[PDB]
Amino acid sequence: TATLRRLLGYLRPHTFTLIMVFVFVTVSSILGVLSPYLIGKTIAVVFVPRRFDLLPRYMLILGTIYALTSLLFWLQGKIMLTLSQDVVFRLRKELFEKLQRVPVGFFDRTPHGDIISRVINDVDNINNVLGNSIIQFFSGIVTLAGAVIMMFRVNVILSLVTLSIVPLTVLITQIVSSQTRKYFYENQRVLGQLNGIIEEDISGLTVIKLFTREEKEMEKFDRVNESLRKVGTKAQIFSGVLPPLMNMVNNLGFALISGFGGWLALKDIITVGTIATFIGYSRQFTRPLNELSNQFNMIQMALASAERIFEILDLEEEKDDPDAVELREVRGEIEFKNVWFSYDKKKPVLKDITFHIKPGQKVALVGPTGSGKTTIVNLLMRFYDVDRGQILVDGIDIRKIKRSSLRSSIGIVLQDTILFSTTVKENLKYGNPGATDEEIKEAAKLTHSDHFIKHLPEGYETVLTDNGEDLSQGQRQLLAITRAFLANPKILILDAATSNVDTKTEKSIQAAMWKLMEGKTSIIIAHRLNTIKNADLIIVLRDGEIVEMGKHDELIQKRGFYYELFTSQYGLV
Amino acid sequence: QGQLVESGGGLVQAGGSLTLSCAASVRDISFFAVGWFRQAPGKQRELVAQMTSLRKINYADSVKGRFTISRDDAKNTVSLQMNSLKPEDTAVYYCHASLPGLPYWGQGTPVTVSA
Amino acid sequence: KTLARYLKPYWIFAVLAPLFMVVEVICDLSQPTLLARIVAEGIARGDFSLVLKTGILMLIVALIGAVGGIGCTVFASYASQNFGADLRRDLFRKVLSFSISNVNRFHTSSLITRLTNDVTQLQNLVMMLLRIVVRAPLLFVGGIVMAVSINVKLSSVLIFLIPPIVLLFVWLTKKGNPLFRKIQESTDEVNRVVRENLLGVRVVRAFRREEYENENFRKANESLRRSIISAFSLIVFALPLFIFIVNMGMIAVLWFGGVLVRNNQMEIGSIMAYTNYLMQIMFSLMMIGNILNFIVRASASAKRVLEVLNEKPAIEEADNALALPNVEGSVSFENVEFRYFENTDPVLSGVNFSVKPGSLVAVLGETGSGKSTLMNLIPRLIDPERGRVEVDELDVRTVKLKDLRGHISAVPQETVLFSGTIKENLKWGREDATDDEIVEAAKIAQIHDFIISLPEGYDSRVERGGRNFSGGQKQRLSIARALVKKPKVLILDDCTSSVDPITEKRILDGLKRYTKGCTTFIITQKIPTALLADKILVLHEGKVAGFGTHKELLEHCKPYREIYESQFG
Ligand SMILES: Nc1ncnc2c1ncn2[C@@H]1O[C@H](COP(=O)(O)OP(=O)(O)OP(O)(O)=S)[C@@H](O)[C@H]1O
Ligand SMILES: Nc1ncnc2c1ncn2[C@@H]1O[C@H](COP(=O)(O)OP(=O)(O)OP(O)(O)=S)[C@@H](O)[C@H]1O
Ligand SMILES: [Mg+2]
Ligand SMILES: [Mg+2]
């Protein structure tokens, strides 16, 4: 009910163009009722006078009528095709742009395949409602109103018999249309489910072949595919069950016309001529009634898909504070105030996180697996917000500053390297689009990235594969390091920056890397403790609490956890 | 962990010779650089002989040529041979263990040059 | 042509679907004339004995067509859906057999559209055909025959009406097919744009280039809507032309009809019958023209489906291959040379070294040497151009793929976990592995400490990509998963890159203890973790640098000294 009003709600600015569609469809329908009648009426004035008296004169009249009607149906289809695709385009655009506003906390939990299906399949599914189902509806309502007036002109009493079956006609349609939409919605969610396994398995097939999960992922697919088959048949059957079921109601209707025209035919009233004529008038009324009842059932297919489209449009998106402040004259002051954060909100991940970082400081966040180092970084990037605590970037709180200006001041190098499927040049150009080739090539030469780019088939213009897996795992890291160093932020995050990069090449950057790192605040995460030892402040993390703090030399003689961490690198005791 | 044991020292006549042995217990020398330092009454801990794991020795220009360093990899001990002792050598000699930012110092062997 | 093989097992439902349509067309066309025969006898005789008796008979005929109508839908929907459902499972099986290269030939974003949309286009074709597969020819062949007795010498006009109608759909096939293919090609772009923002939303938000991707989507969305209107314009342009030939056909009937009155060949009321037959011929002609429009959309989608099925995988199992029930672990390389692209320089070349079974081997080198690439030759993930790989002193190609891969376990450089739970993810190596077995492997990989400290233990939800955990935890899980499989040949591509130095020690010593008869290989970047291995292997620029002890490689092997220098000085 509500979804239908919202679906047709996208046709609201198109109303001015839609009025013309109603005009052109009515003119072509009136010409489509007169033309088969005129050929049967003028034929009587052909057999009686004969010769070339009236035979070639009527051909020029009919020739212009048939040409005007043929041009009318073409004009109707041409203007509707443009309008149909523009409603589809706007619906597709409104979905992708909603995803860019939606928080990260949706992407990780929901399957990727179902999202793609909701744009590629579900919006291609609402093509059966636009154009074809619109022209036919407006043609359907004019022929129904055009025939009901003809029936009342013949007999008012006999028209009420054909009108008493109309509430029962709407009754059967509403029972079918409710089930048709019910099965078609289930068909689309299982399609998105199947789309989930397709996307997931393809993007990670190398892992599947390695652990020989070929039949296991096949049975995981077949469990959803056989379920899609069982709902698919139910959707298709219910879609095409209304036309033959309505043909039964028509045949039962004509059986009652001959039935009542038998008992009443015994008396002086009701003639043989009156029954045969009223059948012809009821036929011109049943035909649009069958079509309008079927179209309402055929649009349920689109209604079920549009229902999945509005679910994404109803999702709660990222919202900034009304008094959003744009951070001007960024220095690099970072401060945490008794921060407590949990992802599942049940098991607290960060238990009391508090530290002060002055601008232009190299901070080395260190600690064991699953401590909360990446969590402190993610909260700073405002991907997630603190339950009870404060993050003050350059004096102002993280909540008051808009996400748009907060991310403008901070550049990142993620733990799990992600790369776009464009040219190497366009991938490094992310974060700073104003970067010239003189900037790009000099930066890449300093981070040892340019060493392997000049060996590629198209060089800097080599179009990368999805996630850039056509390169070595360390090679990808060096690309992400440059990307952020080109973006030139006042605050930089080097979360697991040189994990897959070798110890020898990592040192070769270090000197040139720090030259670009000076005059900026940088939080570096690494388990290569002997590289991050020269940082201005070292924050040792454990379970999600700050255990040891200060400079390297001070923490070594302390013989605490940092000493236990550092000595563990070298297995020589 | 780390532990350093110093052997030798004592007193010797001017323009003579002496051997200073630095034994590293519960540690394998083959990976970290070996060091030698000295502290005289009123003088800073000035470097004597420094040798990295890749065999690269850097003696101080004032004690250069005279002093010779030795590292026995199978024995796990670092020796410092002294040749022609001068009155400047009258200081408590220390041994040094390197490793990337993780050092350990020696106890101090006694050296007194008589004139 | 090969698409029919999937409709072949469901031929019982495929042959009964048009059979019910014949029952339906008879019970709908003959019933109004049969009902009139009851009316005709109702005025001739009347009474309760003739009107009421036929009143029961007319209800029966109405029920036959009703069951015949709904019966046509059921027999066709079951056949159309089962065609698509069996087509998808045969395509997914072929995509599962594909090698990393075959998944990159067709784009990852295109394969999704092929396995879903391109199946649906063919699925709708079977549905559209089955309904008017017997309705279209029987109303055309049976339609002209009824008109043949009415018109004399007008047969030549009917034969001449065939070529302009044939040209109307032949032009729609010539220009249609490449344009309808451009629609399915443009969907692959909006599929790629959405997947790019989905896999790595954190990268888009961090650099605020959300508007750039919004513009990137608008550039591809406009590309799709314009690709649709370009192919669909052919259908719009064919409408006034096809309708005009029907009007021109009626003009030919009226012109020649008046001549027949002068010659006295057709009666005064014979024009009523021929105008009714002319409508049945044109309506049946429109029925062929409608399914042919679905054919051009389906043919463009058929090519995309068939090319995925006919695509030979880069890694194939030999017909006369001998299955290996037991693997000792005798790894050997004989002048192995591999290249990814013909235009580029060789990745690996002149690699020849023998590996003892059970012994731990440390593999070190610079970024872009070929450590991961060489380790991919062992479970047959890549085939060399020159030279051969030998497992148990026998070629890898001669051994069955499913048997060979079952004995070799690996820990990839980029750890990727899948949907389900920790237990559901760990059971990838061996689904037959009982709770007692999977726990001991997790006690080696230190991950068991944390596994139990979750809301449901091993049954704690793991989301696509493992993204619902910490970097090192994904890595810690990945180690235990390879140990679960119980191998005789083990590969550890940067095993503890995202793990602390304390846990790092615990994992390595936990491996040696449980690899007493397993050819273990560890791609390591650290020197102190490389000493734990029996024989240390060195790789640089592509060629093999050195194979021997730590004492040998420091004086003989040149690149080994360079990596060692960055860690000690
Ligand atoms: N699928 C691929 N297509 C083309 N080139 C590839 C592919 N995989 C790897 N390479 C190239 O092969 C070379 C060595 O790759 P790897 O074996 O991944 O390197 P590596 O020694 O493991 O280095 P890391 O991962 O950074 S420690 C590099 O120059 C890569 O660009
Ligand atoms: N999105 C998430 N959902 C649920 N739990 C999470 C999520 N991200 C991280 N965690 C948990 O939060 C804790 C800390 O995660 P991180 O901040 O990623 O760890 P870390 O300090 O970077 O550790 P590494 O990556 O293994 S060295 C761990 O117990 C994780 O299981
Ligand atoms: Mg992390
Ligand atoms: Mg690699």
Numbering used by the authors:
A (entry chain B): 22 to 594
B (entry chain E): 1 to 115
C (entry chain A): 2 to 570
Can I see the authors' text?
Type I exporters are the best studied class of ABC exporters and minimally consist of two transmembrane domains (TMDs) each comprising six transmembrane helices and two nucleotide binding domains (NBDs) that are universally conserved among all ABC transporters. The NBDs undergo large conformational changes in response to ATP binding and hydrolysis, which are transmitted to the TMDs via coupling helices to assume inward-facing (IF), outward-facing (OF), and outward-occluded (Occ) conformations. Many ABC exporters including the entire human ABCC family exhibit asymmetric ATP binding sites, namely a degenerate site that can bind but not hydrolyze ATP and a consensus site that is hydrolysis-competent. The binders were instrumental to solve a crystal structure of the transporter in its OF state and were used to probe molecular events at the extracellular gate and their allosteric coupling with the NBDs.
Using the high resolution structure of OF TM287/288 for molecular replacement and as template for model building, we solved two additional low resolution structures (3.5–4.2 Å) of the OF transporter determined in complex with alpaca nanobodies Nb_TM#1 and Nb_TM#2. To this end, alpacas were immunized with OF TM287/288 containing a cross-linked tetrahelix bundle motif13. This approach yielded nanobody Nb_TM#1 binding exclusively to TM287/288 in the presence (but not in the absence) of ATP, as shown by surface plasmon resonance (SPR). However, crystals obtained with Nb_TM#1 did not diffract well enough to build a reliable model. Nb_TM#1 specifically recognizes the OF state and binds to the bottom of the closed NBD dimer, occupying an epitope that is shared between NBD287 and NBD288. Akin to Sb_TM#35, state-specific Nb_TM#1 was found to inhibit the transporter’s ATPase activity. The IC50 was substantially smaller when probing the 2xDtoA mutant (KD = 16.8 nM) compared to wild-type TM287/288 (KD = 460 nM). This difference was again reflected by an affinity increase for the 2xDtoA mutant (37 nM) vs. the wild-type transporter (KD = 184 nM) and the highest affinity was observed for the triple mutant (KD = 5 nM). In conclusion, Sb_TM#35 and Nb_TM#1 bind to the opposite ends of the transporter but nevertheless exhibit a highly similar biophysical behavior of trapping the OF transporter.
